[PDB]
A paper describes a structure:
Bacterial contractile injection systems (CIS) are phage tail-like macromolecular complexes that mediate cell-cell interactions by injecting effector proteins into target cells. Using Streptomyces coelicolor as a model organism, we and others previously demonstrated that S. coelicolor CIS (CISSc) mediate a form of regulated cell death, which influences the onset of sporulation and secondary metabolite production in response to exogenous stress and unknown cellular signals. The purified assemblies were subjected to single-particle cryo-electron microscopy (cryoEM) for structure determination, yielding the first high-resolution model of the CISSc in its extended conformation, which also presents the first example of a CIS IId subtype. Our model shows that extended CISSc particles share the conserved eCIS architecture, including the three core modules: cap, sheath tube, and baseplate.
The baseplate module comprises a heteromeric assembly of the proteins Cis1b/7/8/9/11/12. The symmetry transition from the inner tube (Cis1a, C6) to the VgrG-like spike (Cis8, C3) is adapted by two layers of the tube initiators Cis1b and Cis7. The first layer of the sheath (Cis2) is bound to the conserved gp25-like protein Cis9, which connects to the baseplate ‘wedges’ composed of Cis11 and Cis12. Importantly, the CISSc ‘wedges’ consist of two copies of Cis11 and one copy of Cis12, resembling the baseplate of Pyocin R2(27). This is in contrast to other previously reported eCIS, whose baseplate wedge comprises only one Cis11/12 component (AlgoCIS, AFP, PVC) and a Cis11 extension forming a cage around the spike. (f) Ribbon diagrams showing a single baseplate wedge subunit, which is composed of two copies of Cis11 and one copy of Cis12. Furthermore, we did not detect any structural components that resemble tail fiber proteins. Interestingly, this analysis identified the baseplate component Cis11 as a significant hit and possible interaction partner of CisA. Importantly, such a protein-protein interaction would be consistent with our cryoEM structure, which shows a peripheral surface-exposed position of Cis11 in the baseplate complex of extended CISSc. The resulting maps of the baseplate and the cap reached resolutions of 3.5 and 3.4 Å, respectively.
Numbering used by the authors:
A (entry chain e), C (entry chain d), D (entry chain c), E (entry chain b), F (entry chain a), G (entry chain f): 1 to 140
B (entry chain o), H (entry chain p), I (entry chain k), J (entry chain l), K (entry chain m), L (entry chain n): 1 to 149
Write the structure that this text describes.
């Protein structure tokens, strides 16, 4: 059977295509939701009918260390004035061996927010720019 | 100095600071230069979590080095430093300091130039009626910038 | 008596039938509520009448380590467009002997949300995908 | 004065009568509120009148270890469709030996919610089902 | 004078008159506020005029260990249906010597809430009934 | 530069004029904002105009140990019925030498709230009455 | 690549031009959001179209030790009655070598709030005035 | 102070506090003049680290003193001091104090004036049946204002 | 008591509790009068946080005195005290107590009255097959009011 | 018991539990009858903060008393006990227990009747290649109800 | 087992791990059969808080053994084991292991089977130029499931 | 080497770092090959906790390895390394490193290749006037990647 240990929260691979955003360093909130609609059957006490309605994908917060290649993402965001591009990106989780556990792919990408570094004379850390991203669908 | 295998033995301290130090200065213990470190867990695209990238920090300071003036003689210059300084008056409280190290023969070789001094404490030893050794007026001089050289 | 058979909160068995979702790893929020209606009698100070009105079953969050069999869940969730299926679930608590202390079976389930793994280069843990579950009633 | 007999918060006795709910293990929130209507007398400043209006009793959350006798609770809760009995309850506080400090009693009860156990493969504890109970007034 | 007589917050004396509520053990929230009304002078940027309007006194939460004399406060609260009584109340702060620092008094009182003891088999504490009390004004 | 003389947050001086309130012990929240108004140019994406309109000062919470001279404050607050007085207050921050770093002043004060001491039999602290202060501008 | 040179959050340089504001000590919140309008295509279920709309820049909170040069900031803020000059600020992130990583700049600025020092006789720290800056486009 | 190597010997304590002292007494424990710490990592415009600036602090009080009177004789002044504080009566509780340090020959050379004494703790030694030591009625004295001189 | 230097000796304990004591009593330690302090960092118009005045407290209690009966003989008195407390019955649990300190000659001189005592620990020594010392049935006694005198 | 001042000796442990005993048992080093306390800061009327009122709690169990069966011989009885609790089977793991204490002459006098034994821990000694002492198969036994007598 | 109580003298270890053995292996540290408890506080209708129930939990495992291979000779299997786990390859790094305890005469009597070994640590001894006691290449081995037998 | 029972005995270190850290140098230590351990509490049909699954981690690195260049001679190359890192200049501070181990005869047998060296600390021994040994200029070296071999 072997020991197919599952995706550790450490090994991964994050990337964006198209505009030279490169490879990122952290991900959060990758999620798909459906909006159930609840109708209470009048003549029957005991439950409330659950009926599915549409599917929606929530936004993702990708973070990376601040590197001189941050001029690209700022340029990409400001490109919305003269025409934007939706490149297709990926999110993958791996094990220590570098094999593949589950590879998801964002069908289309739209920037939403870019929380820049939090400069601080005291705190001993490393600047972590936060680039949000708007989901559009899962690839297959 | 004398040999390619030298050792500045423990017996060679002295302090030249604008507060009038006296014959006994004896023990002198803590003195270092700390920089500290951080962690970047940068990962490329091969999938490895990557080596823990480490980057520079500021020159961590406040390394008070305790000067044990063996003997609370009538010379109250140490408490005076604390006193005027406690009531403010930094015009006469910064008092950049210096620690001198010498060879077997009393010649300076390495000097730990300091930048600012505080004298932020002064503890006296236990006063047991029946002991043998002396009284220690320990000091806890503090810095602003780290030592030099 | 036999020194009783006390309940416990470690040994369990969490499963979903139907699509090959398999056995999960952690439950939460299994709860039933009613919606009381408070009518306050005008001429009798001292209390507000409490009258029962319907019952309502709350959602359930199930978590498990991110295993390569997570493709089944995304297939199930994204099957709303072409027609969904409600299998029958189960939530059972056990003692270490492997015997049964209380067995609850969800009458009809329905996906609501799927919070995927939270990849993080610095946090030593294991990815725990979360599959929220809608409800229709207990079984007997 | 027998060095008094000061109340404590460990020794107690919690029970519900009627349906075989048995004796519970933890209480919370036992409270009575009296709504006050504030009228600002426009003539004079410096204070606003306070007048009493009605007396409302808040809910109580009773918890106990999950035991095979939890099937009785689900039968009681899911009996709304056929009729609910309101048996009298009892909340009491005792000292070390087991004498009485102050015995309260709920004249009429009603289930409001039942938060089941929070199963978790790692957290070492004991499953604690929570039965929220409505209220109608104290007994004397 | 004489090395001053500095106020403290551990010695006190709390009591309610009239109904045999006795002496309490803890107080909180004793406060007076004035609802200012802000008017924006249109032609003059630089501030907003502040004008006083009325005075309002907030409620007080008094706590004591649960003692068999808690039957009185429950009786007093449930006396609204047949007429209530508002006796004067006293809140005083003391030094260790027992000499007066600043003695406040409540002109007229009224129950608002009575958060009873939080019974718990595990927590090692002492039951602390809470008697919220309304307010009318400070005495002089 | 004489090794400069940077400000700190221990040495200070807090006082109110007029009624014998005396010298206080701790300030908080001294602040001045500007009410900006955002208007979005229709034909020019990429930014939102930041037009500056007015300026609003915020309240100040001054705290001091409870001393027998607290009768003056209650007299001042409860004087709004028969006519209030707005003295001029000062807030100054000093270095250890007792020199001046930045001396602010309050053009016209007005009480807002007075949170009295939080009496407690267990906690080992000292009563700290809080006197909120309304504002009219900075003196120059 | 000479072992790279990744950015950090200790070395920086914060400055405001124009009035003698000088150089500040700590930034926060530098961000560029993009408002997205979600339209749910009724024909097909599976996502919600994401369409970009405008770009808005959030506020920036700048802090520095309280120094006698704080009179300039209050003069600048209280100049809105006579007109505000809007200089061009600068936010930069550096490495220990003093070289550049990514230098940003603020096209136009506007004071929004100035939270003064929080004086406290107990807490030992440096008084840190906070200046809040309204924003415009990014310079290039 | 006989010669420039005085090393004021530690076996010479005494103190006259306002309440009656004791014939036998020893082990006057730690008595210091401590100061706090202020940190303000300042930033210039070279992008430099910025030496961590250090500032002034309040003279922090509550210097605990562990006076050790040999044994609990019929004298009960120490337990009358604490029993007096536990009820109040600051007219007889808040009392000045003065630790005296004596020269190599029994003459006073330096005095530590204490602004306000309290006697906030009296602790007795173990009562082992078979030991050879003596009872110790150790006291703890705190201050309102730090010591002087 | 005899000389003006009473080295009041460690070897003189005994106590009378209403619950029958023991002929043999191995241990007695950890008895004190404890009161804590406030820290008001008051301010004047000169701005100096010059002093931190301190104010009086409750008589902090629960001073676990730790009685060590030299051995757990057939006398099960101590374990009856705790086993009585565990089920309640304050008529027999809340026992007054009094530790006696005896003079150099075996006479009482000072008595620590214990206002209200009630045992909460009857821990026992370890059993080693090859050791030499004895079984110690250590008792921890809790108070309600601090000791008097 | 023969003399008028017996105090027991460390050399008299033995215990009968329903699982088989062993020849030599070096140690058993924890035996507690702990019960905790409270704090009520009750106020009367005249103003004092009042005595620190204290009340009665559960006889908190969990007093696992570590046992040391000197020598992991071929008798695997202890590791069979734990291997049951690991897999459940509480019908045979929840064992009643006892501890026997004997006099200067080997005869039981006091017995520490336990109420629920568990054997929740088995730890072996270090396998040093050159030491001299034996191998200790230390067992930790947990309770449900505290000891009796 | 030759006598009634000959136990097991600690000089008889040897490992059986799949990777190549070692001549010396001159230490073997703590091994455990760890399993802690739970806590319920159930009270009966009578009113007592009742004996605190203690139920069970999983065998925590994660047992770490500091196998000390005295002397870092050219045998690099230990540092090949960890360097293998650094990059992955569970096919060769997840090797079950066995610790053998041998009788007074060198024959095996008891074996501690390990269900999964990891080798998550190798630490070298200090290198003091002028000291003795050789170099220790201490290894820490982690488990997935606890030991057996 | 020479025997099948060898030990890489003490008194045989050295280095090859590009900073001229040569001649007198003793007591390097605390070398490590860190790897921590994950935790999963896996579940199955049976309902048993499924033991304790463990999975791999980053190579922790950050191994501060302490070097003690006994005696600060006129050579100040160590303090030039740290003073270089304080201001930056990674072209000269981020130095590669190597620790050499020699066998019973002075020949290298194993090398602990160090990927990145930093020298984030430098301390000095106590300057006591009247002691015997020598000043120790202990250096702490940090890494980016773990040691190799």
């Amino acid at each position: 059977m072997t020991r197919k240990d599952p995706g550790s929260s450490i090994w991964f691979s994050l990337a964006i295509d198209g505009e030279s955003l490169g490879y990122f360093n952290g991900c959060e909130g990758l999620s798909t939701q459906v909006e159930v609609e609840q109708r209470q059957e009048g003549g029957n006490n005991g439950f409330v009918w659950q009926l599915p309605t549409r599917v929606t994908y929530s936004n993702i917060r990708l973070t990376r260390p601040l590197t001189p290649d941050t001029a690209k993402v700022a340029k990409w965001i400001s490109s919305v004035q003269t025409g934007i591009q939706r490149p297709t990106a990926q999110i993958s989780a791996l094990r220590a061996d570098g094999s593949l556990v589950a590879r998801w792919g964002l069908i289309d990408v739209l920037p939403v927010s870019w929380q820049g570094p939090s400069l601080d004379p005291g705190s001993a850390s490393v600047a972590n720019e936060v680039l949000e991203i708007a989901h559009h669908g899962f690839t297959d | 100095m004398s040999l390619p295998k030298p050792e500045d033995v423990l017996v060679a301290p002295n302090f030249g600071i604008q507060i009038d130090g006296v014959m006994v200065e004896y023990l002198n213990s803590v003195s270092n230069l700390q920089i500290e470190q951080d962690v970047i867990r940068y990962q490329q695209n091969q999938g490895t979590t990557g080596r823990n990238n480490v980057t520079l920090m500021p020159g961590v300071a406040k390394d008070g080095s305790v000067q044990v003036e063996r003997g609370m003689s009538q010379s109250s210059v140490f408490t005076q430093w604390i006193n005027d300084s406690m009531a403010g008056r930094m015009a006469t409280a910064r008092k950049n300091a210096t620690i001198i190290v010498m060879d077997y023969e009393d010649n300076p070789v390495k000097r730990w130039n300091l930048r600012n001094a505080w004298c932020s404490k002064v503890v006296a030893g236990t006063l047991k009626a029946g002991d043998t050794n002396a009284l220690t007026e320990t000091i806890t001089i503090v810095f602003e910038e780290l030592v030099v050289e």
